[PDB]
């Protein structure tokens, strides 16, 4: 007897990591070390039926990680008071292209100690007077933290197992020949991104495309790669940390010192991989639903900055990248058809977590010149509903609900229970 769907997930993690960094603090507080036994061991026959996209385990891992995020919001992060009005100016003393600025170095009036005293203070805002924040601002900061995803294992309790499709070619709703039962997963890293999977897991054999409803264009298409497309992101923006402890209740930072005039924040994607991978993707598409069609990739359709750009994080700052460079190639149905692609990005401090309960700020980006090298492990796509007279199919970057990213990770785990 195998009964499914039980919100019960054990956890596993730790080696050299402890506290400080918020991910490290979290894994430390919610996980115990693992053991290198796990045997799984598939048993002969025992079914061919499965369906990864109706897994409530995903929704569990999701709501868990978010609640944990609030549990991090509790101690140090400041929901108040200082965002009122900003006396900002610009470093532009001569100009072309009407650049204005995303980053501004500003002056302020700040409650320090005692009653109603102020001192002149530097403030930076990522996006002249006023302007403030809109109806919420939690400021994370904190003395000892950081933000890098840490491997988190999900395990089944006592009297429970987890079946696992080891079939390389799964239709997602369908015929699976090899079922095994593991007690604990290998350890999943919590990468929060859209459009591409960064870090994550690779396909064992070939590139695999997966959709909950290949006809319904509103449903996402998790495209998993057998190979990584490079992406190196260098944001050489510089900020010097100054945390003025002037008052007991108050804990203020001061960023925006020095210089270096770094261009925005910068990134790259490396293309050779992107050439073969995109060709092979249109190959898979044309060997699945797309039989004879020219495949075109336009950029994001529009929306919130988190939706229009590849919004991901390089250690707690929220990067937004113009994504035209990833989606600007028309793939000819007839046949297939040192330079690197350089993508324009921006660092944000003010992000909107949760629902609207509050905004989250990583206030003092420490140091400067911080490059994050990543492996493009993925694509999350939504199809542009087209016609058949166009003799072409258009595909756009979609996403937003990270639960889709977990289905893209938790695709081979379904918690089950055993009965005599």
């Amino acid at each position, epitope marked *: 007897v195998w009964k499914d769907a039980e919100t019960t997930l054990f956890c596993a993690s730790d080696a050299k990591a402890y506290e400080t960094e918020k991910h490290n603090v979290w894994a430390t507080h919610a996980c115990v070390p693992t053991d290198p036994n796990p045997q799984e061991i598939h048993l002969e026959n025992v079914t061919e039926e499965f369906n990864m996209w109706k897994n409530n385990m995903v929704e569990q891992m999701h709501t868990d990680i978010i609640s944990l995020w609030d549990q991090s919001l509790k101690p140090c992060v400041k929901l108040t008071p200082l965002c009122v009005t900003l006396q900002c100016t610009n470093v532009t003393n001569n100009i072309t292209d009407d650049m204005r600025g995303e980053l501004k170095n500003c002056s302020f009036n700040m409650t320090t100690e005692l009653r109603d005293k102020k001192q002149k203070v530097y403030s930076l805002f990522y996006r002249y007077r006023l302007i403030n924040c809109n109806t919420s601002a939690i400021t994370q900061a904190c003395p000892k933290v950081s933000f890098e995803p840490i491997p988190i294992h999900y395990c089944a309790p006592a009297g429970f197992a987890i079946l696992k499709c080891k079939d390389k070619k799964f239709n997602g709703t369908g015929p699976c020949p090899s079922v095994s039962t593991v007690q604990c997963t290998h350890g999943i890293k919590p990468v929060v991104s859209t459009q591409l999977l960064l870090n994550g897991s690779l396909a064992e054999e070939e590139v695999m495309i997966r959709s909950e409803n290949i006809t319904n264009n509103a449903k996402n298409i998790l495209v998993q790669f057998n190979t990584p497309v490079q992406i190196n992101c260098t944001r050489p923006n510089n900020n010097t940390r100054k945390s003025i402890r002037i008052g007991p209740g108050q804990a203020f930072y001061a960023t925006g010192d020095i210089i270096g005039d*770094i*261009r*925005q924040a910068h990134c790259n994607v490396s293309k050779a991989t992107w050439n073969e991978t995109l060709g092979k993707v249109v190959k898979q598409l044309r060997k699945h639903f797309g039989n004879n069609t020219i495949i075109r990739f336009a950029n994001s359709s529009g929306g919130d900055l988190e939706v229009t750009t590849h919004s991901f994080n390089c250690g707690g700052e929220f990067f937004y990248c113009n994504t035209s460079g990833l989606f600007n190639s028309t793939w000819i149905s007839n046949t297939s058809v*040192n330079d690197s692609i350089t993508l324009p990005c921006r660092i944000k401090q003010i992000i909107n977590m949760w629902q609207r309960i509050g905004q989250a700020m990583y206030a003092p980006p420490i140091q400067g010149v911080i490059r994050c090298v990543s492996n493009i492990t993925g694509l999350i796509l939504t199809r542009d509903g087209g016609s058949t007279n166009s003799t072409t199919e258009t595909f756009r970057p979609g996403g937003g609900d990270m639960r889709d990213n977990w289905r893209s990770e938790l695709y081979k785990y379904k918690v089950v229970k055993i009965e005599p």
Partner: antibody
């Protein structure tokens, strides 16, 4: 192997038009930038211009009004014409396969980004003498 | 100009104006009776068939001249050498730098 062979008249009278051909094997002309370069006797090379099927084409300003570069995809060759020649145009002329590179820095240094070209496969060259 | 050196020793060749902006210098080697042939691109990158005896000076310190260094020189290195300078503050150079003749005193 990519292989270029230039041909021309060897001798041209002053005021006449010099016409040169570069026969290409081992690659298709549409898939490369092509550069004509010239080098007088006892002197350093003097380039001529670069041409691409895309239209990304440019001529040495000093020769601007007298020079024409072309690609012939059907015959897989590259051509040059230079009008109103004088003795100053006497040189060995070379056809080349021209690769493109970029110097890329941080965005803070965007004004200093630039492209450069290098000639990686040269023909054997054709000799041109203009005199009366 | 001219540069002479004994076999096994190191030769150095200077070419072009002092740098003004950021640089990409291309070096070519031309043997007697032959077409020019290359040596280096992107200041210190070599194409297929060129050994690491040949090295170019970085497109770096402002107000300096590009230099090609050849270590462990052999008689086969005897040739004319030319540079083609790309400098971010200068016009495209349509003429190569003045050449230098390397003499190997065998």
């Amino acid at each position: 192997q990519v292989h270029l062979q230039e041909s021309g008249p060897g001798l041209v009278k002053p005021s006449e038009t010099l016409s040169l051909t570069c026969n290409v094997s081992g690659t298709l002309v549409r898939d490369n930038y092509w550069s004509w370069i010239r080098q007088p006797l006892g002197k350093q090379p003097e380039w001529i211009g670069y041409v691409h099927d895309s239209g990304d084409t440019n001529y040495n300003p000093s020769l601007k009004s007298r020079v024409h570069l072309s690609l012939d995809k059907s015959k897989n060759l590259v051509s040059l014409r230079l009008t109103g020649v004088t003795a100053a145009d006497s040189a060995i002329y070379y056809c080349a396969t021209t690769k493109h590179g970029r110097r890329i820095y941080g965005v803070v240094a965007f004004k200093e980004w630039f492209t450069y070209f290098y000639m990686d496969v040269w023909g054997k060259g054709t000799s041109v003498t203009v005199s009366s | 100009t001219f540069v002479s050196v004994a076999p096994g020793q190191t030769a150095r060749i200077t070419c072009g104006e002092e740098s003004l902006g950021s640089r990409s210098v291309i070096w070519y080697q031309q043997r007697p009776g032959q077409a020019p042939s290359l040596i280096i691109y992107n200041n210190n990158d070599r194409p297929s068939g060129i050994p690491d005896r040949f090295s170019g000076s970085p497109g770096s310190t402002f107000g300096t001249t590009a230099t090609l260094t050849i270590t462990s020189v052999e008689a086969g290195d005897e040739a004319d050498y030319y540079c083609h300078i790309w400098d971010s503050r200068r016009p495209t150079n349509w003429v190569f730098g003045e050449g230098t003749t390397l003499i190997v005193l065998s």
